[model samples]
Target: DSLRPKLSEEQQRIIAILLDAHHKTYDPTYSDFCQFRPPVRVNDGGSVTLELSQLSMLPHLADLVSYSIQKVIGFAKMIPGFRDLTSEDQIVLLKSSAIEVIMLRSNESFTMDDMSWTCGNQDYKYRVSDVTKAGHSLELIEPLIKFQVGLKKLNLHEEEHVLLMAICIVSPDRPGVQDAALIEAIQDRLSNTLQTYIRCRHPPPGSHLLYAKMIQKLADLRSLNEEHSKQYRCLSFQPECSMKLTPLVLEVFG
Candidate 1:
């Protein structure tokens, strides 16, 4: 029998903090909106993927994103060293990384079996096509669905996902970051902790390159972030599209 790798006290402390923060945050699946079933599944169209013809209930997506953005900000603050960054650096980090965090957390709400996001109660499921018509084209929605599916297949434990989301922030390469060296050092610690966790908890075959896949997903998020920003800009330019966006979204994406 193989033994699990031992964690140092410091690593254990890190894990505890991340798990606590994750537990503190509100998961959208459990939000009040999801309490009861929708009276009618009018949003439901049997058409799937990019081939359908119905606009998503944009406000639902908007509201969900806004709430998640707030949680990410709070979640980042609880990441131990995050508050040590200058407020300017903190804002830059949040503004740059919040969308990525949202994308990652969304996998929690994403249903791999049917390739749908169950934001509200039963009957309010959103397909990729629905979100596609909201603002984005097949370009972003398609890759996003694929990303969600791949991450779901990995079946990360709560601790792994929380640590990864925390790590997604404090990235050194964002353009406006003031203290890159400090953040890089912090990121190194977080990454090392995640690697150690994987070795100890993930079983063979699954553990094989599991850490690598985590990092690769983060890399994939970079491209998705870029594409989202580009499309968000395009969508926000039109009066109708711009009207649909919330002030919070405009403030962050600005």
Candidate 2:
């Protein structure tokens, strides 16, 4: 096992405070969303090298991979008050691209719209199967399986941490489907289910930023679901009110 870096007294005290605040804010029974996991060793510089196989194994690894990369770029591209950087600078911004981000595309747009559309229309199709009515769901299932396998390889305990990956596959066109409700329900179920599997734990120092950013990403996705849900009717499979379901999933307690 790798030795974690030692924290200063002040840092340790802050951690204790954060942990207590987290406990007070969230349900004790709820699965932890911020549990600590050792970063995978990537190279001599202490950078983590995540293999395609490792990421491909997660239930929705592609989506997470896609989201994470976009997030990294979104933050990196903001070179202080600058409107936006060049194609080259964006890549440079994502210095973690070699380690954390996936699909380090050249000159790709930093917005989620481009990523979502690209994945749904091209990358996803190539990664899985062609989009056909006869096997559309099956094609979707492949990514889920692959993603799950990847996460398992990460040695994540089934009960200890929550898995929240975003995907663009779900659309408003499905029969009797309210696209918004489906997204909300899926997020809630994943978070709630994870609570039963593992005790909630905070990320170690220097990692809290990533932790918060991940949560923010999930929240942003949920907000997207809400905004989109308003434009559509209720989904048959998830008849429960989307409005009600979202709060449970969106709130961080602490």
Candidate 3:
């Protein structure tokens, strides 16, 4: 059954607080997903092969691809020598190391002990940190295609899939016995850094210009309500939420 929509005043307040927290948390313009230059491919000794659509079709594949790109980019920053290298050299190194990344899919419960080593060394052990997939669903294939066509985006050609697959190949390697813990720690830090950056960019305005603009936009669509205000209150109380006076609707995109 469809989840019953919240109706009570208390429920509306809860919704508002949640919305507020989200607005305060991230950069509204941070469309990291939009940054993907799709269908990109990288190859080994042989011919390159991959398709963004193919990866998107794979289960949990988009997450893997996006995370791989993020990790490679992050790891490059940590290398002391990488910063001194020329931009081309930096790109080359990223492509090379990224070529080795791979994502594994498992239906059965697997142990850290079962992880394979690149050199077949028994001394290397794996660490596993399992995360529950947040309940998020998206249906933007048509919209995405239309948007891309309208915008005439580049570096997102149909042939970039091989690079994407190569990205997958290099993503999930367990570096050493202790790599899992280190990676997890870095991920936590990155999350905090990103949240902080976003909050800084979306601070509340003293005037109601943003709120008024939002109301106007919604009104143009023939949507209005007391419920909208209630949702804002719900968003305000979230701990990770951005505490701002910006209304909930405006926060949705931000």
Candidate 4:
């Protein structure tokens, strides 16, 4: 059976535990906070205005972003042998890849309609353009939306998503990594497990290309996150912006 093991039992168990904690920590389908409700509605002319009080939602959203990254870091720490890495290596990997993990985890909230994202239900939806008009660029939003559409079309399974996140976290190429070889081996193991999982779930000719496509998606996510982090810094400096970047967010983006 294609369902045969690719990773060791310990590796599989660690991934399972991390995925379980991840789901429990941020259940996008049910969590009220995970939902993205814009404080201002887009107008017919495409302009939106927000009261200073509504700006509080910005911090709330930033907090959610921070929470998602922190939860991912927590889950990564539970991975077998992750703690064996040097402390500097651990911090560098976590900081470098946190945004990618957050973007991946938050994919559950994206909706194709009007390029909008929602919290948990139909009652809360916000267009990407609205955020763009608020000081971000269309260039950033467009690529992210395109990437989201591509990822959504893939219809990834929960296990695949978790493994992709794990692979992102263990990158040896991340800047300042002190244990590149160690982390690279971990990434390879996770990558192998993901390929095995795809083969088991998707058979025949179709399975042949899905692994490559998913890997491409991870690369696309990295590119999108880079633009996102840049815009985040710009917004963080604007006084009129509703949400100030949380300390954790600044640290992660830096």
Specify the highest-TM-score model's number: 1
Summarize candidate 1's per-residue lDDT along 136-208 as a digit string, tens digits: 7778988998899889888898889988998999898999998999888888888888888888877764565
Q: Candidate 3 on 86-143: residue-level lDDT in tens?
A: 5544454344333232221110112323432111122111111111011111122222
* C-alpha lDDT of residue 98 in model 1: 88
Give the residue spans of candidate 4 off by over 4 A: 1-15, 30-57, 121-123, 240-243
TM-score of each candidate? Answer: 0.87, 0.21, 0.22, 0.82
10 residues in a row with least lDDT, candidate 3: 127-136
RMSD of 4: 3.8
Worst 10-residue stretch by lDDT in candidate 2? Answer: 245-254
What's model 1's overall lDDT?
A: 0.78
- Native-to-model Cα distance after best TM-score fit, residue 251 in candidate 2, in Å: 12
lDDT of 4 at 231: 77
TM-score of 3: 0.22
Can you tell me which runs of candidate 3 are displaced by over 4 Å?
1-59, 101-254
Which window of ten consecutive residues has the lowest lDDT sum in model 1? Answer: 35-44
Q: What lDDT does each candidate get? A: 0.78, 0.29, 0.29, 0.70
